[PDB]
Amino acid sequence: SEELLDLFNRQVTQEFTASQVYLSASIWFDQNDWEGMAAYMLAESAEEREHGLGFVDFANKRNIPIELQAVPAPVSCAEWSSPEDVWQSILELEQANTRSLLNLAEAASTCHDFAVMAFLNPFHLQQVNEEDKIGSILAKVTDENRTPGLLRSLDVVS
Amino acid sequence: SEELLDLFNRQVTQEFTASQVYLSASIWFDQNDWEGMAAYMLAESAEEREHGLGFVDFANKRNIPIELQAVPAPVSCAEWSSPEDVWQSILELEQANTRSLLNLAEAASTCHDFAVMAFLNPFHLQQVNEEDKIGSILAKVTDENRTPGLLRSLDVVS
Amino acid sequence: SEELLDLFNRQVTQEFTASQVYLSASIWFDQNDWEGMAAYMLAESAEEREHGLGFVDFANKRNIPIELQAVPAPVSCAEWSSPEDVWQSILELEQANTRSLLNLAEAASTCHDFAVMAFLNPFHLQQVNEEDKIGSILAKVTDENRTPGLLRSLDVVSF
Amino acid sequence: SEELLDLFNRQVTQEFTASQVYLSASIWFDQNDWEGMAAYMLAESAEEREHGLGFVDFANKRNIPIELQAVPAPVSCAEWSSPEDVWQSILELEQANTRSLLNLAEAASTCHDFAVMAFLNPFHLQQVNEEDKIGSILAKVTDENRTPGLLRSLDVVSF
Amino acid sequence: SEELLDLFNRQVTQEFTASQVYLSASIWFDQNDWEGMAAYMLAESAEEREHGLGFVDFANKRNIPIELQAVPAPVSCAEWSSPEDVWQSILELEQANTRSLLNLAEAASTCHDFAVMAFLNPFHLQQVNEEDKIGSILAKVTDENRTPGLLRSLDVVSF
Amino acid sequence: SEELLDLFNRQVTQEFTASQVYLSASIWFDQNDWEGMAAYMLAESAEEREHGLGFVDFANKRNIPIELQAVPAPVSCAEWSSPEDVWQSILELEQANTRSLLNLAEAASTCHDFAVMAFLNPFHLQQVNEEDKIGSILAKVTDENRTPGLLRSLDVVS
Numbered sequence: 045s046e047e048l049l050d051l052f053n054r055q056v057t058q059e060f061t062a063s064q065v066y067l068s069a070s071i072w073f074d075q076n077d078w079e080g081m082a083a084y085m086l087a088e089s090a091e092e093r094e095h096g097l098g099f100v101d102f103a104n105k106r107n108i109p110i111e112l113q114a115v116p117a118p119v120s121c122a123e124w125s126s127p128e129d130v131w132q133s134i135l136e137l138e139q140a141n142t143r144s145l146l147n148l149a150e151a152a153s154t155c156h157d158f159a160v161m162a163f164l165n166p167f168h169l170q171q172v173n174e175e176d177k178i179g180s181i182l183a184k185v186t187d188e189n190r191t192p193g194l195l196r197s198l199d200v201v202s
Numbered sequence: 203s204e205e206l207l208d209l210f211n212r213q214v215t216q217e218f219t220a221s222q223v224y225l226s227a228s229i230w231f232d233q234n235d236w237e238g239m240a241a242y243m244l245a246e247s248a249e250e251r252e253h254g255l256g257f258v259d260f261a262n263k264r265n266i267p268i269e270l271q272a273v274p275a276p277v278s279c280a281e282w283s284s285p286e287d288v289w290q291s292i293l294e295l296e297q298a299n300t301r302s303l304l305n306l307a308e309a310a311s312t313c314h315d316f317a318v319m320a321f322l323n324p325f326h327l328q329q330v331n332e333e334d335k336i337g338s339i340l341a342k343v344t345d346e347n348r349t350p351g352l353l354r355s356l357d358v359v360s
Numbered sequence: 361s362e363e364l365l366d367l368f369n370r371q372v373t374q375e376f377t378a379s380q381v382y383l384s385a386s387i388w389f390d391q392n393d394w395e396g397m398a399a400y401m402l403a404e405s406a407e408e409r410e411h412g413l414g415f416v417d418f419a420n421k422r423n424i425p426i427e428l429q430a431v432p433a434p435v436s437c438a439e440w441s442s443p444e445d446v447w448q449s450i451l452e453l454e455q456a457n458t459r460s461l462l463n464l465a466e467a468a469s470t471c472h473d474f475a476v477m478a479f480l481n482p483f484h485l486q487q488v489n490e491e492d493k494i495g496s497i498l499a500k501v502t503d504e505n506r507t508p509g510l511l512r513s514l515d516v517v518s519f
Numbered sequence: 520s521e522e523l524l525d526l527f528n529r530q531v532t533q534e535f536t537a538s539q540v541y542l543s544a545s546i547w548f549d550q551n552d553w554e555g556m557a558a559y560m561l562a563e564s565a566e567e568r569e570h571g572l573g574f575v576d577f578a579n580k581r582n583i584p585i586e587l588q589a590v591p592a593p594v595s596c597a598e599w600s601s602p603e604d605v606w607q608s609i610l611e612l613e614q615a616n617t618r619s620l621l622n623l624a625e626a627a628s629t630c631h632d633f634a635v636m637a638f639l640n641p642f643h644l645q646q647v648n649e650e651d652k653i654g655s656i657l658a659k660v661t662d663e664n665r666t667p668g669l670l671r672s673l674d675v676v677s678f
Numbered sequence: 679s680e681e682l683l684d685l686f687n688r689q690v691t692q693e694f695t696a697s698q699v700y701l702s703a704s705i706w707f708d709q710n711d712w713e714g715m716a717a718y719m720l721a722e723s724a725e726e727r728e729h730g731l732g733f734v735d736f737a738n739k740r741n742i743p744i745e746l747q748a749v750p751a752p753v754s755c756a757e758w759s760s761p762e763d764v765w766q767s768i769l770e771l772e773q774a775n776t777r778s779l780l781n782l783a784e785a786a787s788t789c790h791d792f793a794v795m796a797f798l799n800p801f802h803l804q805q806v807n808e809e810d811k812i813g814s815i816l817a818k819v820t821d822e823n824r825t826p827g828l829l830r831s832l833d834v835v836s837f
Numbered sequence: 838s839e840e841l842l843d844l845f846n847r848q849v850t851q852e853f854t855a856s857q858v859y860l861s862a863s864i865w866f867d868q869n870d871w872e873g874m875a876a877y878m879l880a881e882s883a884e885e886r887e888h889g890l891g892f893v894d895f896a897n898k899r900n901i902p903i904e905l906q907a908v909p910a911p912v913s914c915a916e917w918s919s920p921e922d923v924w925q926s927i928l929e930l931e932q933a934n935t936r937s938l939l940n941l942a943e944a945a946s947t948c949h950d951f952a953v954m955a956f957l958n959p960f961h962l963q964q965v966n967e968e969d970k971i972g973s974i975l976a977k978v979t980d981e982n983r984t985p986g987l988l989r990s991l992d993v994v995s
């Protein structure tokens with residue numbers, strides 16, 4: 045349960061970290077005139093923060109102490125030079141989100157914390173949906189960027 | 203305040219001059235079967251004239267003498283051979299608009315003309331928005347035009 | 361014909377020239393506290409501009425090359441000292457608009473340009489209405505201004 | 520700065536002073552059977568008071584101490600014998616309102632009080648509109664009063 | 679100017695930092711069963727974030743480079759033992775927010791960045807309103823806490 | 838009737854004087870974070886001015902010469918150190934209002950000015966209502982202030 049409490053706290057930090065990485069992606073896309081991709085990243089930035097807020101709320105109700113940690117500066121953004129790079133980082137971000145939730149769930153299972161397991165169930169399912177959606181967009185971006193200018197049409201229309 | 207009155211009068215001319223350049227761009231686009239880009243230019247031509255009329259109305263209220271100058275014929279059209287050339291000239295036009303507004307604000311600031319500075323505030327913010335939008339369209343135009351026919355396909359879906 | 365093309369192109373200039381003369385009239389009226397007359401002129405300024413855009417749009421469709429000319433400074437304001445002077449210049453301006461359209465239609469007739477003649481028909485009729493309306497306003501202004509202050513009383517009530 | 524605080528506090532007095540001068544104008548107009556002009560003045564009296572309350576409310580929020588001063592007796596009525604005299608005093612009053620606001624904004628600028636400058640922006644623009652409107656009414660009144668009875672005819676129709 | 683750009687970038691960090699301090703206040707309140715005060719702090723956490731996004735959006739449009747900085751761990755919460763302590767840190771936070779906006783506007787003034795000054799105007803006015811509201815809540819919290827249990831009684835009704 | 842015309846003119850001044858004292862109370866309350874009491878005072882400041890305007894309108898109709906006097910600066914604010922002090926001064930203000938209306942009615946009665954007495958009737962009844970309301974608020978304020986913080990709790994619920 046000490047491990048559970050420590051991981052629950054780190055999960056807040058993870059959600060807020062992810063929020064900031066999505067924000068840096070939104071900024072990179074806007075700077076490079078990919079306004080449609082930027083709006084998607086901005087929406088996820090708000091949603092990851094809300095996820096973090098949901099964990100905080102559950103923890104307060106369940107007497108899991110929360111100590112808010114620094115949210116580190118997002119760093120992958122230094123390296124991005126095409127939309128494909130940005131989507132690839134976002135995929136890895138969500139894969140790491142998924143792994144941290146599964147690790148938290150396994151800590152909860154070990155100490156028979158059925159309430160935490162129940163709380164995590166809709167998050168496990170949303171991660172399935174999200175990794176699928178991001179993986180698909182990444183495939184489409186990679187394919188369309190094979191012809192000069194063509195990826196600009198993904199952004200403008202969809 | 204002489205400088206302020208002079209610059210305020212020149213700003214009207216600048217707005218009507220830009221309205222004419224936008225009309226020239228709309229004609230070039232229509233002649234070359236870019237009806238969607240032509241519609242955008244025609245809307246901006248009307249907006250610029252409305253801005254000129256706004257300055258005229260304020261000047262009349264505040265007793266800033268207005269002497270309507272000739273609106274010079276647009277010339278940049280003679281060098282346009284692709285939509286990228288046209289959008290680049292429109293970007294330069296809006297950048298010149300922005301600079302003329304900043305110089306006018308500075309002349310107002312110098313003679314403590316708070317009412318003129320207050321009047322200009324929404325125009326300064328509008329120019330921020332417009333330069334961003336124009337700069338973004340130009341980047342998309344330049345990229346899409348890397349593939350024969352692709353730019354055409356995205357005039358039509360707009 | 362080359363002549364119809366030139367005149368069609370000049371017609372755009374005439375409509376924008378008229379738009380600017382109307383704006384100049386609105387400014388004189390506003391500066392001199394005739395806000396009702398000023399509103400009328402501002403409405404016409406917008407409408408003349410709309411007429412010019414209608415000509416441009418037809419030209420683009422019909423492959424009549426358009427080259428936008430300078431829109432001259434409106435200079436009639438130099439001799440405006442009363443509302444009657446302004447309305448007289450406005451009458452002359454609409455008389456010139458009408459003549460310009462008639463000359464254009466004559467060039468179209470000479471080269472059998474039935475589409476241009478058909479396009480101009482509603483504008484010929486509008487000019488009839490407009491010259492009549494401006495001529496009547498000028499008569500009213502001229503008459504009311506025979507008594508001090510009376511013309512003011514009717515900028516306020518009307519327009 | 521101490522100067523911005525003093526001027527901000529004086530601005531409340533100026534708005535209430537103006538409110539009372541407008542009420543005095545409404546009374547002169549009512550006593551002399553210009554009920555249309557009187558209504559206009561009464562509307563402005565209420566509005567100037569509302570402007571003063573807006574300044575007080577901002578001051579309270581921003582911890583600018585307000586000490587309410589005497590609102591002087593409006594004395595311009597002593598030389599009012601025609602509507603033109605009243606409108607001329609009203610023009611001068613709004614010209615003073617504008618100067619007062621500009622002096623305030625200058626003190627705010629000098630001490631980098633961006634919040635006070637931002638607060639004043641809509642009032643600077645309102646003063647532009649108001650000076651223009653009063654200047655125009657004064658011109659109309661002055662012109663119509665050149666013919667006996669004519670100005671009356673336009674208190675009734677308008678205002 | 680490059681400096682103004684740095685101060686603009688740091689204002690984003692300032693807003694996100696404030697967001698997290700408001701979140702830490704919400705947590706302390708919830709942990710101590712002050713759910714009403716907690717909800718208020720959560721609302722401000724969202725709003726401070728929204729302000730930071732507004733700055734980011736303006737910067738992207740105006741080509742002001744945005745580099746997202748670390749958001750430091752909130753530390754004041756280690757020291758809070760009563761709602762009065764928390765409200766006092768929140769007041770200092772907003773006072774700090776106000777000072778940093780004024781310093782940014784001053785940098786903008788120095789380099790004639792009229793667009794930046796215009797953008798900031800609503801935020802200056804919002805800080806005036808917010809400091810007033812927080813200052814007032816703190817004063818009520820301080821007063822009500824003089825009687826055991828009374829403060830509780832007004833987390834429950836108000837908030 | 839000289840006395841009546843004099844008192845009628847002094848009544849306008851009294852109403853505007855009370856409007857200013859109410860504004861002063863609203864400022865003291867706002868400065869001391871009693872926003873609910875401040876709102877009440879601000880509403881009364883507007884009402885008193887409306888009463889003054891009512892007297893002005895009647896006077897103009899009935900040809901009672903009106904000469905607008907200075908509206909003196911409120912001074913009672915200098916001695917206010919708690920809400921009870923403020924409410925006590927407002928009670929005294931309304932009591933003075935009532936007395937000035939009664940004296941004016943008496944002067945009207947003496948010169949048989951039935952129209953002025955009829956005009957005053959709803960104001961006499963309004964003052965009855967207002968003195969009762971103010972007297973009642975003062976009693977509640979005085980009682981609630983016996984316990985630290987308790988008065989504050991009841992400004993907020995109003």
Ligand SMILES: [Fe+3]
Nearest residue numbers: 088091092174
């Ligand atoms: Fe999502």
Ligand SMILES: [Fe+3]
Nearest residue numbers: 088091170174
């Ligand atoms: Fe989602």
Ligand SMILES: [Fe+3]
Nearest residue numbers: 088092138174
């Ligand atoms: Fe996500």
Ligand SMILES: [Fe+3]
Nearest residue numbers: 246249250332
């Ligand atoms: Fe635009």
Ligand SMILES: [Fe+3]
Nearest residue numbers: 246249328332
């Ligand atoms: Fe626009």
Ligand SMILES: [Fe+3]
Nearest residue numbers: 246249250332
């Ligand atoms: Fe534009």
Ligand SMILES: [Fe+3]
Nearest residue numbers: 404407408490
């Ligand atoms: Fe017309």
Ligand SMILES: [Fe+3]
Nearest residue numbers: 404408454490
């Ligand atoms: Fe016409």
Ligand SMILES: [Fe+3]
Nearest residue numbers: 404407486490
């Ligand atoms: Fe028409």
Ligand SMILES: [Fe+3]
Nearest residue numbers: 563566567649
């Ligand atoms: Fe007004």
Ligand SMILES: [Fe+3]
Nearest residue numbers: 563567613649
């Ligand atoms: Fe006014």
Ligand SMILES: [Fe+3]
Nearest residue numbers: 563566645649
């Ligand atoms: Fe108004």
Ligand SMILES: [Fe+3]
Nearest residue numbers: 680681683684
């Ligand atoms: Fe730097």
Ligand SMILES: [Fe+3]
Nearest residue numbers: 680683684743
């Ligand atoms: Fe930098």
Ligand SMILES: [Fe+3]
Nearest residue numbers: 684687743745
């Ligand atoms: Fe740096």
Ligand SMILES: [Fe+3]
Nearest residue numbers: 722725726808
């Ligand atoms: Fe807020």
